[PDB]
RNA sequence: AGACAACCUGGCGAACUGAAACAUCUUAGUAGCCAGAGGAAAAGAAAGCAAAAGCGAUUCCCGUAGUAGCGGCGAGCGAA
RNA sequence: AUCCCGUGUGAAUCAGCAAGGACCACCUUGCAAGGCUAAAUACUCCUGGGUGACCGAUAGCGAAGUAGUACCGUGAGGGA
RNA sequence: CAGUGCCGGAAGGUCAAGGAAGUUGGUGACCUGAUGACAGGGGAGCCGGCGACCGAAGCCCCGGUGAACGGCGGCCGUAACUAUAACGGUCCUAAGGUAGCGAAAUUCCUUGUCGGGUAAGUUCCGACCCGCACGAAAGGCGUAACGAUCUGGGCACUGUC
RNA sequence: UUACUGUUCCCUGGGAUUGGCUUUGGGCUUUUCCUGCGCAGCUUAGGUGGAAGGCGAAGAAGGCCCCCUUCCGGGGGGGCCCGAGCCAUCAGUGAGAUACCACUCUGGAAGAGCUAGAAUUCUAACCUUGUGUCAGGACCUACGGGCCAAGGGACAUUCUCAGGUAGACAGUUUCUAUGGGGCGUAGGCCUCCCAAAAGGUAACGGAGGCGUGCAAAGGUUUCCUCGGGCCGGACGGAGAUUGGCCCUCGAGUGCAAAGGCAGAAGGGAGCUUGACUGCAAGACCCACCCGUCGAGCAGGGACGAAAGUCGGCCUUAGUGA
């Protein structure tokens, strides 16, 4: 089916240095849910970027 | 949608349904326009006529 | 009462055109038709603009300004 | 948003109402739902003066004599 | 009587304007945090957004109606010589053309084949039906009379020749 | 015209013109109840509070009976009868009384409000008619006006809004290269040839594919060599799986072709998410728009012991300002 879908982090609406939600374009997920370790979020080390 | 208001009347003649010549039972504006006001049967409640008389 | 070139006001009110087609838009509330009226007519004496500073009815000219905008954000339209 | 209308609902009087570009609160401004007014302003069927790097009988008004005439069309009208 | 049109029907589905329980948002007297240059929550009032549910006709559906729109099929086989198909099975439709007509104002092949007429007739008439692509009120088949109708032939008649 | 956008006639709903009476009757309320099988239990645990007191003789336990939801297990009172009790902490029990009540629930009633819808009629709105009657100097049996009468009647009519709905009507569109056409074909991207040894290059010239797919078929480390003929092995043969030699790139790379790629860019295994962020000197292509490659820097990482590599895929197609 090849659904396009966004990965997203953990939201954390805060007053840090540009702290905001980070979503990333990704594809192929017609399977079990795959959190990949896409990183360099607004918080600079990150893991398990969900959906 | 919308409802039209009910206009007050003071009687002068015996109603065959509700009122004997002096009651203040308010019914409908069209029932005053078409029936009561031309026949000399009801009037409009005004403070200039009701309160001092 | 009727007549009156043009301007003016009120009402009905297009289309060819431009958009390289065309329907939103433009041409255009223009032309035309009817009615009215005067040397001018309309408007006009703030339930107004403006912005914490201030002006004092309406009309017209220069300007802001082809600016802010509006628009199949096209063609174009365009203030205050 | 302001302004004016079609159908229907339908307020408040100054301790208020309306506007300040959805709207709410505060402030500021003004007082709709009643009327009348000259001037600056636009034009020429014209009138009286002064002009013209405007014309000179194929020009300038269509028209320098019968000119909107002769002539054409039933007529609107066209037109020397 | 499938599709379309028209009529009738109401059970159900879809369903606009509008009404409306509820939910939610903005502003906001007031109460709280606040090494910040402010913020969080929020009563009533006012202004809104979504909106369960009601909401007609139409439409979907059901049934009827060819002098309503229109349409009326392919595949092969087998009867005592050659045949041809009375008859049969199969596929698909809503149904597979009924009477009569039929190389026709309709036939491409085609000047189809036969017979008549002619010395000789792609024209004419009478037949067969292989009807490209007739056909029953866009009517079909006939016929007396009629036609400045089309077309085939004959007599008389003549410079048409 | 079953092309598009509409308009109009027409139909159908909310408002208004638009009222009076009573029924059928769907949703809200105006008080009270029959009413509730997790547990060991006098008992089919209605979530809470008032709790040593109420029902009582204005006639209570228990026997005579009508009714119902029903899990007919068990209950309610209308009439008569009976004659001094139903208890109340009891032990069970998160939470307790069938002594009592202010509330109120899955179900309904009593008489009342409110709102539908539908129906019945009445006339006074509104519509139609009258050679019925009256009228001015005269008539209006000439339209019409006043009065009266009859038929309808809150329907119809008119207006606004909303849905549907006729080429009846209106404004328009209906591509191009071409064979300068019905009957075709193609329009954009990629590979080879044409293309004449840089690059480019046309024809409705010759051949093909594409409008993606992969959580690995991406990244890193490491290991390995395929493909074909022959020979051996009662299933098994010409050909499956296994052993050995020969040729050494003829196999393969998600798919079309071309150019590549043999200790590989081909096959396997481990760990993995760089299929990141902020960028970027300089180049190619170049009408413009575009499109392609890229050393190098910072952050934060993946693999590896490190060196280093990684800003997706061997590349070119898989797209749209």
From Swiss-Prot, chain A:
One example GO MF annotation: structural constituent of ribosome
Name the record gives this protein: Large ribosomal subunit protein bL33c
Subcellular localization, as worded in the UniProt entry: Plastid, Chloroplast
Keywords on record: Chloroplast, Plastid, Ribonucleoprotein, Ribosomal protein
GO terms for biological process, alphabetical: translation
Shown residues in whole-protein numbering: 9 to 59 of 66
Subunit structure: Component of the chloroplast large ribosomal subunit (LSU). Mature 70S chloroplast ribosomes of higher plants consist of a small (30S) and a large (50S) subunit. The 30S small subunit contains 1 molecule of ribosomal RNA (16S rRNA) and 24 different proteins. The 50S large subunit contains 3 rRNA molecules (23S, 5S and 4.5S rRNA) and 33 different proteins.
Functional note: Component of the chloroplast ribosome (chloro-ribosome), a dedicated translation machinery responsible for the synthesis of chloroplast genome-encoded proteins, including proteins of the transcription and translation machinery and components of the photosynthetic apparatus.
UniProt KW Ribosomal protein keyword: yes
Highest taxon, organism lineage: Eukaryota
Coiled-coil residues: none
Curated annotation (Swiss-Prot), chain B:
Cellular location(s): Plastid, Chloroplast
Domain of life: Eukaryota
Quaternary state and interactors: Component of the chloroplast large ribosomal subunit (LSU). Mature 70S chloroplast ribosomes of higher plants consist of a small (30S) and a large (50S) subunit. The 30S small subunit contains 1 molecule of ribosomal RNA (16S rRNA) and 24 different proteins. The 50S large subunit contains 3 rRNA molecules (23S, 5S and 4.5S rRNA) and 33 different proteins.
Reported function: Component of the chloroplast ribosome (chloro-ribosome), a dedicated translation machinery responsible for the synthesis of chloroplast genome-encoded proteins, including proteins of the transcription and translation machinery and components of the photosynthetic apparatus.
Family: Belongs to the bacterial ribosomal protein bL9 family.
The name this protein goes by in its record: Large ribosomal subunit protein bL9c
Organism: Spinacia oleracea
Phylogenetic placement of the source organism: Eukaryota, Viridiplantae, Streptophyta, Embryophyta, Tracheophyta
Portion of the parent chain present: 43 to 95 of 196
């Amino acid at each position: 089916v090849k659904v396009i879908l966004e990965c997203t982090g953990c939201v954390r609406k805060s007053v840090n240095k540009g702290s905001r939600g980070v979503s990333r374009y990704i594809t192929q997920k017609n399977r079990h849910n795959t959190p990949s370790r896409l990183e360099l979020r607004k918080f600079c080390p990150y893991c398990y970027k969900h959906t | 949608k919308k409802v039209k208001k009910i206009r007050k009347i003071i009687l002068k003649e015996d109603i065959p349904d509700l009122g004997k010549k002096g009651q203040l039972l308010d019914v409908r504006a069209g029932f005053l326009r078409n029936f009561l006001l031309p026949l000399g049967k009801a009037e409009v409640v005004t403070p200039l006529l009701l309160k001092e008389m």
